[PDB]
């Protein structure tokens, strides 16, 4: 990574946690801001570090490398490199590949990210593979939000976990989330519990949902 | 985090601390100096990297978003933000969502709390998440300070160590947790050792009160 | 804590190795030194992070308070806080409570520490904190060495391994408990041993007596 | 390695990380972008520790001392070094195997990889190993892309982690990459899958085609 | 400690390994070079630190105590402290007790250490407690070295493995023990191989001893 | 160790590294490279804290000094000490028991390493010890490189791994070494596999004898 702007080299107990998270979690949600977490300030040889030290869920890392390009391929579109000598005070456009690493050297990824202006090729990279790993999370649940309903004798703080839980896997905007909140969490409740929460206005906070239905 | 003023990122070691105490511990109070030792220094960045970081728990972490909008909306209406250009020597007012980190970049944030004078959105940030932890803390105590009464062959140093670990999560002001303890401890003590503790004068400290009740 | 002088927050190992050692030894007297030498250099914040993140024993941690207060109070008494407009060039003077932390923020507690002349408040803390922890080592030892009495079977060097450990958790000054060496080690050695030493001059050192009632 | 540009020794757990690498992993494929990781900006002297302190795999270990010499002599037969006392100002040329660091000192070593321009024996010796590292990993996978084909109940999921996982250690251009996945993936898919697939158009992503799957 | 010479505290995982040694090893031999390995550079608040946190063995632990006051009254009757006030340029004399670190501040020790000429009562209050762990060590060992006897099936490997441990553990001069070598290890050999060992020249070195009774 | 040059203490975990290693592999070949590895930059002293730290093997380590003490009396007769006083600008010349370690102190050690030119007391004293630890090595393997036989039914794979590791142990210099595997590896073959490499010309690589035998 690049600490305050000095570079540095990825860490043994950075990579060893990477590997160990999804060689423990596979790809549940979490897994995504601890790889946000471990690659601060990461450079795209950080970044392909990595994904390439992962060991089998080799189908999801095809995955991601084709989502990869799919972006790459978008910022050639809209970058296009120009032809011509790259003049003494300057520094060549940088292509997708160059940003995924596949194409750059480290000294050429320094110079972007510390050139005034700064050109973030590991911040953009970053958001590509986080890009590529929703996907994977997201097809990796096995369940949808909608499927999610309160047993009968199950306990609400459990029922409101099982659905914040399978929430964070879904793919949907914030307003798709808040309806979902707003409308399912109570829908899909167990009638007991339902009926207590319908008491309550149209317009309270889970806090209030949730001390409601703590004695049924 | 921010060391002496240098920005750093979130170590691996100090994440997995914090992955740990929540996977170890639920929401038992001492979670929240741990919380904070953790966070010592940190960004809205690190302090929302800490709490996505933790998996499961996803009704109290729910929870914790709402209190933080709650603390979010209350800035805004006190703190408004102003339109016009910003100036070249200035940086903008932040908002709860900067506060939060949701709509603010680690730069801005980075310049927010490293500017003269300072504005602490970490240490501000830091006071809503702790705020909302205590509301989770607190609703997942089983059990009230009230409920806690010493058994007929209960060691005192045992019914003490209940009676201060039920009462560390109870929602209270320092008085009135000084209340209770002037009040309910002797209270509830067993008849043998409740008689001793009366005949020591009424103001007697716990250190009197614990070796005052050792042998019986 | 602070370095060579450059603040940094306490670490997640130190907190780790602390949280540990009380979850190890509950009081036992080595506790204390390790207390002392993981906050070498602590401000009160670093004291308070230390003390809140122990779960459990919360009978004693309650104790620690009332002695901290006791303490806390003694220092308002010696040095009153004066009114006042603090003037430019100076900070404002420290209560109990700001030296405890309760009532500090980490900056001002930077700013005495560092200002000249020292005004080390997380020393004058620790010593609070350290006395209040005697306290507790002190009642929590079942055992007096006045009680440590050599077994007719048992080699010296455990008898007097007993000796020297109760001894440690006694509250006594140095010249008391040269006393008690010098008294009841012998004392209350078994008869075959007692005998042995008592030939030794009456003032041999406990090399001279291990190695004399080795065989024995 | 060499950090930001001061010189630094291996690190105990950078080699502690290598060793067990080896010794769980053998010659996995991920073994090697392992490998790349610790050896961030490593010395001559720094990747021959790394290769030393391999026990076992002794028949891999000495087919890498060939593939090395292989291309130390190459580098040899382009850049011969010539005869003449090395000036105050200059440094020698290196040879293969001051690269490979049997014949060079570390000093010499810094020197070049330093001096202005620079001349990076350590990314140049770390190719040479990573080729005869690949030369390893290739022999030692038993099975054949070829050889993978889909069992008539194996999710598909499965099979395309088989085939990637295999592919990963094949010995082939990208081009012959892309042409195993755009070929074998699909015709040896089982019949059931196999035909779903076949009536997505026949450039399809990966995404596509598991998702198409999923229920069969 | 002090490194290269700024101040710092003594590390977690100092402490640690210092405890632990104590913990796994009791007195053996190695556990004195670890103590001086851990000490490197140490106060005499770092070392009195070290030896506060062991727990139990506490009779060697008293022992030691002892003798750091033999040495230390030997340093005040050599170094008698001067009456008089301590000039503005100049520092006090250290006594025993300064050196031991029971009368003499953190700043004090660190002001002794530094100034020029040094005064390094860390090494000196060092070897006082290296001088009572021998005796520590020594008192410790069951066995003398005269007792170490080659058994008559014993591998020659393992009768000089027994005996230079238990020889590292004697009160002996390097000529002494240079005595022990050359008289008692052939001496003390069984019957087979201790003639094997005589018909080499009585000056050959132990190389050639332990492969002269390789198969025997 | 010495970094960059500033002075730095042998550190916790390069000490439990190598405690560890002569723990679990005794003397195998790979334990020399860790030694030196995890004493990259190691002064006289680092060097003797690693040796006496070792608890046991103490025959070897007595037959280790006796080697670094042939090599510090050669040092002494190719380089006398001159009588005569030590001018106030310069350093004395090292004798043998200097650069062992055993006879001078960190300062001058430090002193000698960094003056201009410089005098590596360090690397000359390891190579010493790695003299020493061949001498064990090598004496300490039972089997010799010419009873590594090939099993009538042990895969080549297999007994190119005991050929090479049994190899790694031999006192042989790189030609002799060189002659071994060109002679006894294929030699030493069993005779299906032996007739197999025979059809290959005589100077063909590892890689293509061990393809050559993979089926057989
Ligand atoms: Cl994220
Ligand atoms: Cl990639
Ligand atoms: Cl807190
Ligand atoms: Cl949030
Ligand atoms: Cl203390
Ligand atoms: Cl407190
Ligand atoms: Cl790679
Ligand atoms: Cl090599
Ligand atoms: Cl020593
Ligand atoms: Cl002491
Ligand atoms: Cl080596
Ligand atoms: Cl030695």
Same mark, same amino acid.
């Given at each position: 990574?690049?600490? !305050?702007?000095?570079?540095? #080299?990825? =860490?043994?107990?950075?990579?060893? #946690?990477?590997?160990?998270?999804?060689?423990?979690?596979?790809?549940?949600?979490?897994?995504?801001?601890?790889?946000? #977490?471990?690659?601060?300030? *990461?450079?795209?040889? +950080?970044?392909?570090?990595? /994904?390439?030290?992962?060991?089998?869920?080799?189908?999801?890392?095809?995955?991601?490398?084709?989502?990869?390009?799919?972006?790459?391929?978008?910022?050639?579109?809209?970058?296009?490199?120009?032809?011509?000598?790259?003049?003494?005070?300057?520094?060549?456009?940088?292509?997708?590949? +160059?940003? *995924?690493?596949?194409? &750059?050297?480290?000294?050429? !990824?320094?110079?972007?990210?510390?050139?005034?202006?700064? %050109?973030?090729?590991?911040?953009?990279?970053?958001?590509? %593979? %986080?890009?590529?790993?929703?996907? %994977?999370?997201?097809?990796? &649940?096995?369940? =949808?939000?909608?499927?999610?309903?309160?047993?009968?004798?199950?306990?609400?703080? +459990?029922?409101?976990?099982?659905?914040?839980?399978?929430?964070?896997?879904? @793919? *949907? =905007? @914030?307003?798709?989330?808040?309806?979902?909140?707003?409308?399912?969490?109570?829908?899909?409740?167990?009638?007991? $519990?339902?009926?207590?929460?319908? *008491?309550?206005?149209?317009? #309270?906070? /889970?806090?209030?949902?949730?001390?409601? $239905? @703590?004695?049924?």
């Amino acid at each position: 990574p690049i600490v !305050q702007m000095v570079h540095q #080299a990825i =860490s043994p107990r950075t990579l060893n #946690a990477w590997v160990k998270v999804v060689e423990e979690k596979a790809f549940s949600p979490e897994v995504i801001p601890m790889f946000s #977490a471990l690659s601060e300030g *990461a450079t795209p040889q +950080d970044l392909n570090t990595m /994904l390439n030290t992962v060991g089998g869920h080799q189908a999801a890392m095809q995955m991601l490398k084709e989502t990869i390009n799919e972006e790459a391929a978008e910022w050639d579109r809209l970058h296009p490199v120009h032809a011509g000598p790259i003049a003494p005070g300057q520094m060549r456009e940088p292509r997708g590949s +160059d940003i *995924a690493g596949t194409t &750059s050297t480290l000294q050429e !990824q320094i110079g972007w990210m510390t050139h005034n202006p700064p %050109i973030p090729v590991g911040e953009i990279y970053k958001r590509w %593979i %986080i890009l590529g790993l929703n996907k %994977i999370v997201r097809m990796y &649940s096995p369940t =949808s939000i909608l499927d999610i309903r309160q047993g009968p004798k199950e306990p609400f703080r +459990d029922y409101v976990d099982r659905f914040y839980k399978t929430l964070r896997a879904e @793919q *949907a =905007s @914030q307003e798709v989330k808040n309806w979902m909140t707003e409308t399912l969490l109570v829908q899909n409740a167990n009638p007991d $519990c339902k009926t207590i929460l319908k *008491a309550l206005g149209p317009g #309270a906070k /889970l806090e209030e949902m949730m001390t409601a $239905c @703590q004695g049924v």
